[PDB]
Structure formats: structure tokens, C-alpha cells
């Protein structure tokens, strides 16, 4: 092979530093330690990238995830061996579940100490095998550029995801003394395959042109291409097809559009769920038919199943990964590869549709029958969490600024999903597949680093926020003016919801003792605001959003409020529990009796 | 025939509750979630044990470790699937490295959903394989009692360690219909081997009786038996053998005893290191010759190696785990099994030594010329961190209470180890093998739960404390009046030491921005105290330990103060860097010069 000598004489650490600029890395999230010292010495004062220092490595990981979701670039993490590495397992597993591109670099003990139960040695490659797309231990400095290039390529192609690169201390401290192949130092289709994909596209167009009640079921995959939302909208307009998104597709479709069905699934709106259950054709675009979406699989999409049996519909799946094709539902047509690219190729084959009067009339009736109803504020009552989301959504949107929302995990997360009006791609950043509490704050910090001009709001739960609240001071140190909203119901609400519904109001260890959030914000160097009274909510939300610098707003909200609608257990998507104020009142009395007045 | 029907009609969750009682568990540390709901329902209002709720599952893990180190009982952790499980990887790796008995129960998605990339599904058995002695996924409720009994047995036998038991939701929700073998529901050596051990004991006695300059090298293994320290003291008195301990053996030997050599190793005292390098016989008791202890292995113990070649000494190893014998160093005699048990069998074969005048004269000369020296306070100077430990040591002892000390990781940890006078077993609880920053606070909480009557002090670093400071509120909820001391040098001191020494004072990302610790303590519901002035120190320390409830004391200490002595790099144990006041003053000028005054 051709040889490259440009790195000869540099340490592994210096080569790392150089590769970052070559991989277009502008930001690194990390925390130093012994094993990774030679790399830290090499990036000392580097103007190649901004370095962000969290208080805990899990924070670096979630920051990198938020950065990635906001920027479209891989999040880069740099931590030490042992506990440095084990502390990023959660964010890696999280990134793997949600398809987030991340490259995690972990220091490792010298190669000669590996396998001796050495100081701060973990089998990181073993530990992270099942929660990365790929991982590797670099065994020589000669190998370092190759592994870095492979890592970035793997993380950002196919379905994006995390990769881990283990860096032994002797490798990063070693000087490169051999020339290395030029192929290894530079970053970065079958004809029958292309023709096959084009065939599948022709068939997909044929099926779509045949459908009388189609639904577009859209997920995160459409957001992995700049033109995704635009092409989705063009197809929806051209063929008059209503659009529902998963939790992770929120923002990919303008919810102000009359063809918007909002979110489907366990806590999706009834209209989206009913449309899916009655559709003759489901066009799945960058979504993986997760169990939180389909409800009971045997009851899922009966009209599409009927249509398939009669050769006049079923399910079309635009999917980039073979692992996810036919994994859950039998698929009539799989269109393999990037969804956006394939929609573009399909477009001209779709017959323009004048109208779908009957289908849209039915959908509009469902919209009138089943809004996201809930128990609203009454005199003397506590503030309702759903109301907070609705008001903040309007206040934030009215600034005219680009707005990005992150969340923790639980009821507040579902209410954010439901009651915010989603209009822009890459503006909702939430932990869906793994559902990691504590995601909200560091993800917001990372997102703010990616988009310094954006209004970044973490809509968080009190228990979620406790998980990673130490990163408040990191936000100040990083100069990220994040807006932290805590919907404080003094409970792990999502868990108490399940305990209310399925365990006869037995609240087993679901009430953590919260700190004073306002004094905490002040201790951490932020402005802290609290609202308790209905009458002050509007003014406080405006002050919150208008504040220059990072700010925390705690809203005391009502407790034991269920997220509805809800599809759970053996229920099909059309068998949801709906909001009913009389039932809520009865369940409240029942709860007080069963808990002996404790809750 | 011998089938048991007492669990018939119980859910797996309810069986779990009963099994905790049979295993004499009095405390469970955990955090609930969806997959583990059936177990939480079953333990709701349980009178079998107390439950401790942290803010983060890593907190649960470290609390359980602290609880285990202080009580001698396995720490039990109960968390949910997915992120709940991945959040306990660090404590498991930590407990694995330090040999701490822990049984981790993780909820898992239903067996039907396993392997489908389900909601909150992680491959927990795969992930935790390298950091547990043993793990298992329970596949039927019939199998549940068996796996629980196996878990506890493995965790507490041989070298103690963490085990993981994965609990699918359908298994814990399932009702046992079938009788199960009675033996599976009840908790819990060849005479050839016994003779072989006896043979080794005989040979080891002869070698000891022959030694002229013997050293007892004592580790954590001696603390795994109630009679350990007693038998250690007996052997030391009888054969007049000086005793040095590892970091993890601290407290096993009375440091007030004239035969104490204090701690050996990288930051051990000079006398201990010199004694080890000049010994003709090293008697290793429950210690694994870690790289932080031996220094450059090829320079380690030359006098014992010399003696081994002439058949007049060498190394004796009392080790419970066969894989840790002849793992680091060539051993003349290995005594397999429990160290304490084997010391008891050996004692009567040891010849009582009158005196070792020459050996102890040499040792006492070293003690006089190489004490733990450091730069002491001067008028107008900042408080020295070594001085705080010394004073706190005395103030804590004067309370008359049983004192337990935990720490974070870094310089403060080494200073705690060096400058405290250790006299009682199971009173120093620190992360040694993995070295996990953030260990200090949750370990203290766990220790306080184990020993409600003890004075528990977390001597912590500012950076370490930031890692897990959210658990402050958990301490209040748990009713544990821990005393938290922060030696605040506004730096990752241990890392800056290495950067000062080996990287020409290039401080790459080792200065994190701290919150106001006093305001933080108050927000968290604790009393907060601060000391800046030398004159205030004694009074504040006294107020600190005299405070009834939980309390945080921040002491502002001098920065860029190295931990000495220090053995690093290619250095042997006798080639340590020692303290010198003029060199320190020179280092200060050099540092100021190189940092432009910033550090
Ligand atoms: C408390 C809670 C409640 C929840 N309830 C709901 C709910 O009610 N409704 C809901 O929808 N979700 C819900 N979830 C989230 C759910 O668990 C999943 O995370 C989510 O549904 C996954 O959405 P997705 O399929 O669009 O994204 P992903 O999981 O990221 O899947 C994307 C799919 O598109 C593919 N893909 C990626 N890139 C491309 C590309 N360039 N071209 C083509 N294909 C591509 C991927 O391979 C993958 O198959 C909930 C989560 C939590 C924590
Ligand atoms: C910043 C830092 C600095 C450090 N510097 C030092 C230092 O200067 N000096 C030092 O000593 N440590 C130091 N360490 C700690 C070091 O890394 C190890 O954790 C420590 O040396 C291990 O001590 P140990 O061998 O006694 O315990 P362990 O690691 O737990 O090993 C105990 C051995 O005894 C065996 N054993 C267990 N139970 C029994 C039994 N019942 N019978 C017989 N055998 C048994 C075990 O199998 C094992 O082989 C440092 C750590 C940090 C974070
Ligand atoms: C981090 O451990 C190692 O990389 C390691 C492990 C096993 C064998 C050899 C090494 C390399 S090392 O002996 O030179 N130590 C090192 O690189 N860093 C180092 N940093 C400290 O504080 C930052 C403290 C400290 O020991 C307590 N070691
Ligand atoms: C934890 O996930 C499951 O155990 C699981 C995963 C895949 C398939 C089936 C299940 C069981 S389940 O559908 O009945 N859900 C469940 O047990 N808990 C549950 N808890 C929530 O918050 C407490 C929220 C929530 O979905 C958002 N699911
Ligand atoms: C790390 C982690 N631990 C446990 C869970 C299980 N869990 C899911 S939602 C939830 C409660 C969240 O409470 P909160 O953050 O306050 O949001 P709320 O539902 O009250 O709005 C819990 C404990 C989880 N998702 N992640
Ligand atoms: C989780 C984790 N991350 C990183 C490290 C690397 N590390 C070891 S000691 C140290 C500095 C600790 O600073 P501090 O807690 O303030 O103690 P100090 O040395 O200043 O007394 C670091 C960053 C570690 N041991 N653990
Ligand atoms: Mg909406
Ligand atoms: Mg809550
Ligand atoms: Mg001492
Ligand atoms: Mg410090």
C-alpha cells in the first residue's frame, strides 16, 4: 500500500488531537484521569475544539447525546479508564436504543497490564459490546488513525449509534516510529441492489396509488436527512395522506397542518391511534414498530392486515437497517436504505390525489371527539402540569427564537410530547428507547453547546432532575444559558400512575424527598424561580424565558394526575383509557382511603 | 418426596420478600421502575427489612458497598431494567475490584420480550459478566428461590464479590403453582486438600521460624473474618514481626503498636517500603500485590528474592483465591484458604521470639528520619490539608464514639490514609481497586445504616463530592446523620499532581467550577459550615462532629500540595520522592512561572 509519514514522530495523544480536526470535531465532552493523561496533555490549550467539563462522566455522555441530536454531528466523549468508562455505560446504552451517533474514547491501562486486574482496569470492550454498534481496543499507535476513522464512519452510517474506542496509556504515550498506509489516515453500491431498491419503490408507489385510507407512520429516521421533513410534507400533500409520528419523530411534521394526526402509541392521541387501526395502508417511514407504539401486536392495524390479505394494502416499511425489517410485523414491501433518498425517488411515481373526503371527515370527527382532555385548574386548586406545557409552548414560540426542548423521563415527558405544538425538526430531544431519567439537564447543556443561539428548555420531572442535578454548575462553567423547568409533583409520577392503575394505589417507594430547588439553583450559580399560585404562572413563564443566563423555574403542580389516553396490557390501539372527570374524582377518593390518607 | 409447598400461591415478588427474610437481609437499597413493579408491590410495607431510597441507582450501589464494608453482611440492591441496571455497573465493577459482597437484583422485561430490543431492555447479564463473580437470569418462578440462595452463597464465599440476578417481569408477577425441592428454598473441602494445606502451613512455620528480618504484609483478606485482626496481633506479638498494611487493610492492625509500619506502597510511608525491600521474608496475608503497592515489580523485594535463592526466605502467601496466587510474584509457599483460619492452625508451630533488636533498631531509625513530613501552616498561610486530617482524627476520637471514615478518590484520600491513626477494623471504607470518585458520600450513608450508633465521617475531595452530591437529600430522607468533610482545593488535586510532576505543569481540564457547598447543604436540608482561617479550624471541627444531625463542613485548603512520599514510574519501593520544603518553594515558583500566575 501507499505510505504516509506525516504522523511519524508524534505521540498517540498528538495523533488523536490531529484526527479530531480531520474528523470535523468542534466539541469534546470529557473528564480527565490517569490512563487518559497523555491525550489530555496533547489537547491542552488546543484551539481545534471546545472542551466541555461535566461533574460526572454520565453527564458527558448525555451532553454528547444532546449535542448530537441538535447538531446532526456525532457527540465525542473522552474519559479515563475504569470508573471513568463504567460511568458512560448508561449514555452508550441510551444512544444505542435511540440511534444517536456518538464516539466514546476511554483511557485504558497499558497493554502490558491488561488482564491482570490492574488499578482502574475494566473490561470496557466486553462491558460495552451489547450497547455499541462496534467497539475496539487500539493495540498500537500505528493502528490509531485507522480505528478512529472506522469509529466515526460506523457511528454515523446506517442507523447511527455509539461506538467505543479503548485507548491504552502506553499507546497514547508512544511515539509513532513507523510510516502507515495513507488509506488508514484519510476519513471516509451494487447495480442489482440499486435496481432491486428501485423495483421495491415501484411496488410501494403502486400500493400507495391503490390505497383509500392511507396513514403515514413516521419516526426518527426521517430526521437523519436534511430534506426528510420537506419530502415527507411533499408526499403527504401530493397523495393527501395524514401523518402520525412517534415520540422520536415529533418535529418532523408541522402539527399546524390539517393532515397532522399528532402522536400515536401508548400515550398517543386517540385520533392517531384510531386512524392507524382503520387504515388500509400503513406507510412506515424511519420508525421501528416499538412496543410502546403498537399496543398489543395481535390487535395492531387490523384493517391494514385485512387489506394485505386481499392484495390491496398492508404495510410498507422505509427502513435503513435489515435488523429492523420484518422484526415485528409482516411487511408487504420493504424499501431498504435511507428513507429520505427513497421518498425522493418514489415521488414522481405517486399519482396526485384530489381529495379523501370520507377518510378526512372520519378523522376530523375523531379530532372533535377526542382532544387531549384533562382536569383543568379550578379555584384554589394547584397548577395543572398539562396547563404549564400549553402555556410555555405559546410563550416560547412567541419569542420568534429557534426553540429546542429536552426532557427527563415520566409523566412530564409525555405531557411535553402531547401538549407542545411541534413544528420544527430537531427541536425535541428526549430519551425514548432506554428511557433514562436524568437525561434532561445534560442533554440540554449539550444541545445548547451545539446551538448557542437557540432557546433551550429542559422540561424536567423532580425525580429525573435529582438524578443528574450536579450538572447545574457545569452549565454555568460551560456558559450555556439553559432554561430548566421542573414540574414538581413530589413523586415518581409515571410509576405512581402504574401503581394507581394496576396495584390498587400501593405506592411502594415512589416518593423521594426533594431538595429546595431554588436554593439549589442559587448554590449552583443560577437564577432560581418558583411558582405555586395559578395567578403568577404567566408572569413567571415570561420571566423564565426572558432571563439572560441559565435559570431554573420550579412549578408546584398537582399530584397523582394520570397521563391519558393510555393503551396498556393486552389492549389494542383502539382500546385506550380516556379522560373522564367523574372517574378522576372517584379514583381520588379511592386513593385517599387506600393509602390511609398518606397520598 | 422432599418437596416444599409453602411458596405455592405466592407471586415471584412475594417469594422474593420471603427469601430476603430467610437470608437475614435487614436492609435493601433500591429505586423502582416498570419492569420491577411486581417486586416493589410485594415488598410494599414489608416488615422483613428496611428500605433505603437514593436519588440515583449508582447511589444505591455505593450505599450497599458502604453497608457491606461496615456490617460484614452482603449489600442488597434492587433496581429496574434498562437504565436502572446500567446505572449500577460502576458500583458492581467497584465491588468486584475491592472484593465486596453484593447481591444486585435487576428487573428485566418479560421473557417474551427479551431479545426483541424492547422498551428499557438491556443485555444486563452480558454487560455485567466481567464485573460480577457470577450472574444469572431467572427464567421461572420455580427457579427463583434457588437462584437467590446461590447468589448470596457465591457473593459471600471465597473472595467476596458482587453477583447479579436478572428478574423478568413475568417471572416476578407469576404465581407459583408447583411444589419445589425444599433444599432449593433453604440458604446454603477434601481431606486430601486439607492435608495439602496443613503441609503448606508446616512449611510456612519453618520458614517464619528461620527468618531474621520478617515483614507481615497484610491486606483486606484479614478483615473477612471476625477473628482476623486478633490472630494477626497474636502472630505479630508472638514472633515479633513488624506489620504493614495496604490501603484496604487499614484498621486491621493497631497503629499505636510499636510494631506497626503503617501503610506501604506508592504513597505509603518510607519505613514500610524500606522494610519490605530489606526483608528476608515477606508474609502476605489477604493481600494481592497490587501495582499500587509493589512499585516496579522487577525491583520489588530484592532481599526476599535473595533469601529465596538461598532457601532461607522469600514470600509466603495466605490467599483464598487460587487465581491470585503466583499471579504477580513468584511465591515460595502458598497457603490456600481463609487466612484467619489458616493463621489459627499455624500459631502453635510458630516459635515465640524474645526480641529482634537489630531489625527493629533499623526500623526505628527509618521512622525517625522519614516521617510523613509536609509543609505546615505559617502566619497568613492557607490551611494545610494534612493538618485538617490530624486535627479531625483527634477531635473525632475524643467523642468517645466508634468512628467510621469513608473517602472520595484523590489526594484527600491518601492524606486520610496517612495522617489518621487507624486502630479499629472495618473503620476505613474507601474505593481502592477501581478508585471511583463519588464513593464517599453514598458509602458513608450505607455505613451509617449498618452502624446507626457510629460517628460516620466522609472525608471527601471537592471534585469527588460533585460526582454524587445529589445523595445529600437521600441522607436526610434515610435519617443518617453523616458528617461530610470537604477538603476544598478547587481542583482535581491528584491529577494536577501528576500533571505538575510528569507534564510540566500543564493543567489540562483539571479545574472544575464548584457550587457554594454551604448553600448546597442547606438546600439539601443539612447544616452547612465553612472554614477559611487557621484560627477557626479547631472550633469548627468540634462543632462539626458535635452536630446532632447530618452536616457538611467545607475547609478551604492550600492548592497544588503534593501527596508525599511517592513511588511512580520505573521506581522501586525504596526509590520514593520525599518531602522537602525548599523543593516545594522552588516548585511553586516554577509553577507560577509556567502558568502565568493562574495556578
Ligand atoms: C415513558 C415513555 C412513554 C413512551 N410512550 C410512547 C408513545 O406513546 N408513542 C411513541 O411513539 N413512543 C413512546 N415511547 C418511546 C418509545 O419507546 C420509542 O423510543 C419510540 O417509539 C421510538 O420511535 P422511533 O421508532 O421513531 O425511533 P427509533 O427507535 O430511533 O427507530 C428509528 C427507526 O428508523 C430507522 N432509521 C434510522 N435512520 C434511518 C434512515 N436514514 N432511513 C430510514 N430508516 C432509518 C432505524 O433503523 C429505526 O428502525 C415512550 C417512551 C417512554 C420513556
Ligand atoms: C489514588 C489511589 C492511591 C493508591 N495508593 C495505594 C498505596 O499507596 N498503597 C496501597 O496499599 N494501596 C493503594 N491504592 C489502593 C490499591 O489500588 C488497591 O486497592 C489495594 O492495594 C489493594 O489492597 P488489598 O490487596 O489489601 O485488598 P484486595 O484488593 O481486596 O485484595 C485482597 C486479597 O486477599 C484475598 N482474600 C480476600 N479474602 C480472603 C480471606 N478470607 N482469606 C485469604 N485471602 C483473602 C483476596 O482474594 C485478594 O487476593 C491506591 C488507590 C487509589 C485510588
Ligand atoms: C491509572 O492507572 C494506570 O494507568 C496504570 C494501571 C496499572 C498499571 C500501570 C498504570 C500506569 S501508571 O502506573 O503510570 N499510573 C498512571 O498512569 N496514572 C495514575 N494516576 C493517578 O492519579 C491521577 C493515580 C495513580 O495511582 C494511584 N496512577
Ligand atoms: C419496563 O418495560 C416493560 O417491562 C416491558 C417492556 C417490553 C414489553 C413489555 C413490558 C411490560 S409492560 O408493557 O406491561 N410495561 C411495564 O411493565 N412497565 C412500564 N412502566 C412505565 O412506567 C412505570 C412505563 C411503561 O411504558 C412507557 N411501561
Ligand atoms: C435511571 C432510571 N431509573 C428508574 C426509571 C424508572 N422510572 C421511569 S419514569 C420514573 C418516575 C419519574 O418521575 P419524575 O422524573 O418526577 O417524572 P414525573 O412522572 O413525576 O413527571 C421512574 C422512577 C427510569 N426510567 N430511569
Ligand atoms: C469516576 C472517576 N473519574 C475520574 C477519575 C480520575 N481521577 C482520579 S483522582 C481525581 C481528582 C479528584 O479530585 P478531588 O476529589 O477534588 O480530590 P483531591 O485530589 O483534590 O484531594 C480524578 C479526576 C476517577 N478516579 N474516577
Ligand atoms: Mg401536540
Ligand atoms: Mg415527578
Ligand atoms: Mg496513619
Ligand atoms: Mg480537589
- C-alpha neighbours within 13 Å on the C-beta side of residue A234: 14
- Indicate which residue of B119, B196, B351, B502 is catalytic: B119
The domain boundary, picked from B352, B371, B390, lies at B371
Cβ atoms within 10 Å, residue A243: 26
Residue A88 in marked binding region: no
Strand partners, A554: A486, A530
Q: Does residue B182 share a domain with residue B103? A: yes
Which of the residues A81, A88, A119, A246 would you substitute to probe the B interface, choosing the one with the greatest number of B C-beta atoms within 10 Å? A119
A467 catalytic, yes or no?
Answer: no
Q: Give the distance from CA A157 to its chain's centroid.
A: 17
Distances (CA, A) of B347 to A110, B79, B351, B402, B541: 41, 46, 9, 30, 44
Q: Does residue A400 share a domain with residue A286? A: no
Query: Residue A451, SS3?
Result: coil
- Taking the centre of ligand 10 as the mean of its atom positions, its distance from the CA of residue B460, in whole angstroms, is 8
The DSSP secondary-structure symbol of A121 reads -
End-to-end CA distance of chain B: 76
Phi then psi for residue A381, to 5 deg, are: -75, 160
Atom of ligand 5 minimally distant from the CA of B87: 1
Bridge-based pairing of strands A180-181 and A3-4 is: antiparallel
> What is the experimental resolution, given in Å to one decimal place?
2.2
Sort out which chain B residues have CB atoms less than 8 A from A328's CB and list them.
Answer: 116
- Name which of A512, A509, A444 is nearest A483 in CA terms: A444
* CATH classification of the domain holding B137: 3.40.50.970
A120 catalytic, yes or no?
Answer: yes
**What is the rounded CA–CA span in Å between residue B56 and residue A261?**
37
The distance of A82 to chain B (nearest Cα, Å) reads 6
| Number of structural domains chain A divides into | 3
The distance of B451 to chain A (nearest Cα, Å) reads 23
Cβ-proximal residues to A280 (8 Å cutoff; 6+ apart), any chain: A211, A212, A213, A214, A303, A304, A306, A307, A312, A313
The DSSP secondary-structure symbol of B323 reads G
The DSSP secondary-structure symbol of B175 reads B
The distance of B559 to chain A (nearest Cα, Å) reads 18
Residue A432 CB–ligand 1 contact under 6 Å: yes
Sort out which chain B residues have CB atoms less than 8 A from A40's CB and list them.
Answer: 508-509
- Indicate which residue of B63, B137, B494, B524 is catalytic: B494
**What is the rounded CA–CA span in Å between residue B123 and residue B120?**
10
- C-alpha neighbours within 13 Å on the C-beta side of residue A423: 13
- Name which of A261, A249, A265 is nearest A566 in CA terms: A265
Nearest ligand to the CA atom of A107: 3
Atom of ligand 5 minimally distant from the CA of A438: 1
Atom of ligand 3 minimally distant from the CA of A169: 4
**What is the rounded CA–CA span in Å between residue A241 and residue A360?**
9
CB atoms A291 and B474 under 8 Å = no
CB atoms A520 and B524 under 8 Å = yes
Residue A492 in marked binding region: no
Which of the residues A265, A523, A599 would you substitute to probe the B interface, choosing the one with the greatest number of B C-beta atoms within 10 Å? A523
- Taking the centre of ligand 5 as the mean of its atom positions, its distance from the CA of residue A494, in whole angstroms, is 6
Using the CB atoms, write b or e for A151-168: b if 16+ within 10 Å. bbebbbebbbbbbbbbbb
Cβ-proximal residues to A83 (8 Å cutoff; 6+ apart), any chain: A120, A122, B90, B93, B94, B431, B434, B435, B436, B437
**What is the rounded CA–CA span in Å between residue B414 and residue B425?**
18
- The strand order across the sheet containing A455-461 reads A428-429, A403-407, A455-461, A483-488, A551-556, A527-531
Omega before B565 within 30 of 0, i.e. cis: yes
Cβ-proximal residues to B307 (8 Å cutoff; 6+ apart), any chain: B280, B281, B313, B314
**What is the rounded CA–CA span in Å between residue A78 and residue A166?**
10
The domain boundary, picked from A371, A392, A427, lies at A371
Torsion over CA of A107, B415, B492 and B457, rounded to 10 degrees? 100
The distance of A147 to chain B (nearest Cα, Å) reads 23
CB atoms B82 and A34 under 8 Å = no
* DSSP run (H or E) holding A224: none
A3 catalytic, yes or no?
Answer: no
**What is the rounded CA–CA span in Å between residue B151 and residue B354?**
48
Q: Does residue A397 share a domain with residue A315? A: no
Contact (Cβ atoms closer than 8 angstroms) between residue B492 and residue B512: yes
Sort out which chain A residues have CB atoms less than 8 A from B82's CB and list them.
Answer: 93, 434-436
Cβ-proximal residues to A298 (8 Å cutoff; 6+ apart), any chain: none
The DSSP secondary-structure symbol of B512 reads P
Residues constituting chain A: 599
Q: Does residue A388 share a domain with residue A327? A: no
Q: Does residue A223 share a domain with residue A107? A: no
Closest-approach residue (CA) in chain B for A121: B434
Q: Does residue B444 share a domain with residue B344? A: no
The domain boundary, picked from B371, B387, B421, lies at B371
- Taking the centre of ligand 9 as the mean of its atom positions, its distance from the CA of residue A95, in whole angstroms, is 46
Q: Does residue A121 share a domain with residue A5? A: yes
Q: Does residue B209 share a domain with residue B165? A: no
Contact (Cβ atoms closer than 8 angstroms) between residue A435 and residue A411: no
**What is the rounded CA–CA span in Å between residue B259 and residue B240?**
8
Residue A360 CB–ligand 4 contact under 6 Å: no
**What is the rounded CA–CA span in Å between residue B377 and residue B358?**
37
Neighbours of ion ligand 10 (CB under 5 A): B 461-463, 489, 491, 493
Strand partners, B488: B556
Atom of ligand 1 minimally distant from the CA of A99: 30
Q: Does residue A265 share a domain with residue A335? A: yes
Q: Does residue B399 share a domain with residue B333? A: no
**What is the rounded CA–CA span in Å between residue A217 and residue A222?**
11
Closest-approach residue (CA) in chain B for A52: B509
Nearest ligand to the CA atom of A100: 1
Distances (CA, A) of B171 to B5, B10, B79, B135, B503: 18, 12, 16, 17, 55
A44: nearest CB among B118, B467, B508: B508
B582 catalytic, yes or no?
Answer: no
Q: Whole domain around residue B10: which residue ranges?
A: 1-188
Cβ-proximal residues to B73 (8 Å cutoff; 6+ apart), any chain: B24, B25, B26, B67, B101, B450
* DSSP run (H or E) holding B28: strand B27-31
**What is the rounded CA–CA span in Å between residue B253 and residue B423?**
6
Omega before A565 within 30 of 0, i.e. cis: yes
Sort out which chain B residues have CB atoms less than 8 A from A527's CB and list them.
Answer: none
A32: nearest CB among B472, B510, B525: B510
Q: Does residue A515 share a domain with residue A427? A: yes
**What is the rounded CA–CA span in Å between residue B456 and residue B427?**
9
Distances (CA, A) of B493 to B413, B554, B557: 11, 16, 11
| Helical residues (DSSP H) of A135-269, grouped into ranges | 144-156, 169-173, 182-185, 191-210, 228-239
- Taking the centre of ligand 4 as the mean of its atom positions, its distance from the CA of residue A466, in whole angstroms, is 22
Phi then psi for residue B287, to 5 deg, are: -135, 145
* CATH classification of the domain holding A314: 3.40.50.1220
Residues with CB under 6 A from ligand 2: A 119; B 98-99, 159, 219-221, 224-225, 246-249, 263-268, 286-288, 290, 292-293, 318-321, 324, 338-339, 409, 413-414, 432-433, 435, 494
Q: Is A311 exposed, middle or buried (0-12, 13-18, 19+ CB in 10 A)?
A: exposed
Residue A393 in marked binding region: no
**What is the rounded CA–CA span in Å between residue B248 and residue A307?**
69
Distances (CA, A) of A571 to A177, B76, B114: 65, 36, 20
- Name which of A529, A524, A521 is nearest A555 in CA terms: A529
Contact (Cβ atoms closer than 8 angstroms) between residue B96 and residue B162: yes
CB atoms B473 and A515 under 8 Å = yes
**What is the rounded CA–CA span in Å between residue A255 and residue A272?**
12
A521 Rama class: left (phi>0) / alpha (psi -120 to 50) / beta: alpha
Distances (CA, A) of B152 to A203, B96, B145: 59, 15, 11
The distance of B543 to chain A (nearest Cα, Å) reads 23
| Helical residues (DSSP H) of A503-580, grouped into ranges | 517-523, 537-546
Cβ-proximal residues to B178 (8 Å cutoff; 6+ apart), any chain: B8, B142
Phi then psi for residue A252, to 5 deg, are: -80, -15
Which of the residues B16, B46, B52, B55 would you substitute to probe the A interface, choosing the one with the greatest number of A C-beta atoms within 10 Å? B55
**What is the rounded CA–CA span in Å between residue A244 and residue A236?**
11
Q: Does residue B230 share a domain with residue B181? A: no
- Name which of A224, A273, A226, A225 is nearest A245 in CA terms: A273
**What is the rounded CA–CA span in Å between residue B506 and residue B497?**
10
Amino acid at each position: 500500500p501507499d505510505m504516509d509519514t506525516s504522523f511519524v514522530g508524534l505521540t498517540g495523544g498528538q495523533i488523536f488531537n490531529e484526527m479530531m480536526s480531520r474528523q470535523n470535531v468542534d466539541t469534546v465532552f470529557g473528564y480527565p484521569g490517569g490512563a487518559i493523561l497523555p491525550v489530555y496533555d496533547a489537547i491542552h490549550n488546543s484551539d481545534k475544539f471546545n472542551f466541555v467539563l461535566p461533574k460526572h462522566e454520565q453527564g458527558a455522555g448525555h451532553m454528547a447525546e444532546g449535542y448530537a441530536r441538535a447538531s446532526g454531528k456525532p457527540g465525542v466523549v473522552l474519559v479515563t479508564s475504569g470508573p471513568g468508562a463504567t460511568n458512560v455505560v448508561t449514555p452508550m446504552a441510551d444512544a444505542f436504543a435511540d440511534g444517536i451517533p456518538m464516539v466514546v474514547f476511554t483511557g485504558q491501562v497499558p497493554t502490558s497490564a491488561i488482564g491482570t486486574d490492574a488499578f482502574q482496569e475494566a473490561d470496557v470492550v466486553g462491558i460495552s459490546r451489547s450497547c455499541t454498534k462496534w467497539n475496539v481496543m487500539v493495540k498500537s499507535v500505528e493502528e490509531l488513525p485507522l480505528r478512529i476513522n472506522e469509529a466515526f464512519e460506523i457511528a454515523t452510517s446506517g442507523r447511527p449509534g455509539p461506538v467505543l474506542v479503548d485507548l491504552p496509556k502506553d499507546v497514547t504515550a508512544a511515539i509513532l516510529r513507523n510510516p502507515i498506509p495513507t488509506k488508514t489516515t484519510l476519513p471516509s453500491t451494487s447495480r442489482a441492489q440499486d435496481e432491486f431498491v428501485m423495483q421495491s419503490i415501484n411496488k410501494a408507489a403502486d400500493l400507495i396509488n391503490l390505497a383509500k385510507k392511507p396513514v403515514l407512520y413516521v419516526g426518527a429516521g426521517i430526521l437523519n436527512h436534511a430534506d426528510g421533513p420537506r419530502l415527507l410534507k411533499e408526499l403527504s400533500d401530493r397523495a393527501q395522506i395524514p401523518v402520525t409520528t412517534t415520540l422520536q419523530g415529533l418535529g418532523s411534521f408541522d402539527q399546524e397542518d390539517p393532515k397532522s394526526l399528532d402522536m400515536l402509541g401508548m400515550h398517543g392521541c386517540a385520533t392517531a391511534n384510531l386512524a392507524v387501526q382503520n387504515a388500509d395502508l400503513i406507510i412506515a417511514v424511519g420508525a421501528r414498530f416499538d412496543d410502546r407504539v403498537t399496543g398489543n401486536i395481535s390487535k395492531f392495524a387490523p384493517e391494514a392486515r385485512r387489506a394485505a390479505a386481499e392484495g390491496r394494502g398492508g404495510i410498507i416499511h422505509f427502513e435503513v437497517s435489515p435488523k429492523n425489517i420484518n422484526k415485528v410485523v409482516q411487511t408487504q414491501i420493504a424499501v431498504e436504505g435511507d428513507a429520505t433518498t427513497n421518498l425522493g425517488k418514489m415521488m414522481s411515481k405517486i399519482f396526485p390525489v384530489k381529495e379523501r373526503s370520507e377518510w378526512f371527515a372520519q378523522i376530523n370527527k375523531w379530532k372533535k371527539e377526542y382532544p387531549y382532555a384533562y382536569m383543568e385548574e379550578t379555584p384554589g386548586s394547584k397548577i395543572k402540569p398539562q396547563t404549564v406545557i400549553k402555556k410555555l409552548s405559546k410563550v416560547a414560540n412567541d419569542t420568534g427564537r429557534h426553540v429546542i426542548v429536552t426532557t427527563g423521563v415520566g409523566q412530564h415527558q409525555m405531557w411535553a410530547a402531547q401538549h407542545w405544538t411541534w413544528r420544527n425538526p430537531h427541536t425535541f430531544i428526549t430519551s425514548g428507547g432506554l428511557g433514562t431519567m436524568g437525561y434532561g439537564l445534560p442533554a440540554a447543556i449539550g444541545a445548547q453547546v451545539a446551538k448557542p443561539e437557540s432557546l433551550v428548555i429542559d422540561i424536567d420531572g423532580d425525580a429525573s432532575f435529582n438524578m443528574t442535578l450536579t450538572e447545574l454548575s457545569s452549565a454555568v462553567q460551560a456558559g450555556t444559558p439553559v432554561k430548566i423547568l421542573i414540574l414538581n409533583n413530589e413523586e415518581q409520577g409515571m410509576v405512581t400512575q402504574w401503581q394507581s392503575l394496576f396495584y390498587e394505589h400501593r405506592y411502594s417507594h415512589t416518593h423521594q424527598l426533594n431538595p429546595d430547588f431554588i436554593k439549589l439553583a442559587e448554590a449552583m450559580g443560577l437564577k432560581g424561580l418558583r411558582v405555586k399560585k395559578q395567578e403568577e404562572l404567566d408572569a413567571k413563564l415570561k420571566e423564565f424565558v426572558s432571563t439572560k443566563g441559565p435559570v431554573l423555574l420550579e412549578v408546584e403542580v398537582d399530584k397523582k394526575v394520570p397521563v391519558l389516553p393510555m393503551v396498556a396490557g393486552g389492549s389494542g390501539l383502539d382500546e385506550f383509557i380516556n379522560f373522564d372527570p367523574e372517574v378522576e374524582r372517584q379514583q381520588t377518593e379511592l386513593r385517599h382511603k387506600r393509602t390511609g390518607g398518606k397520598h
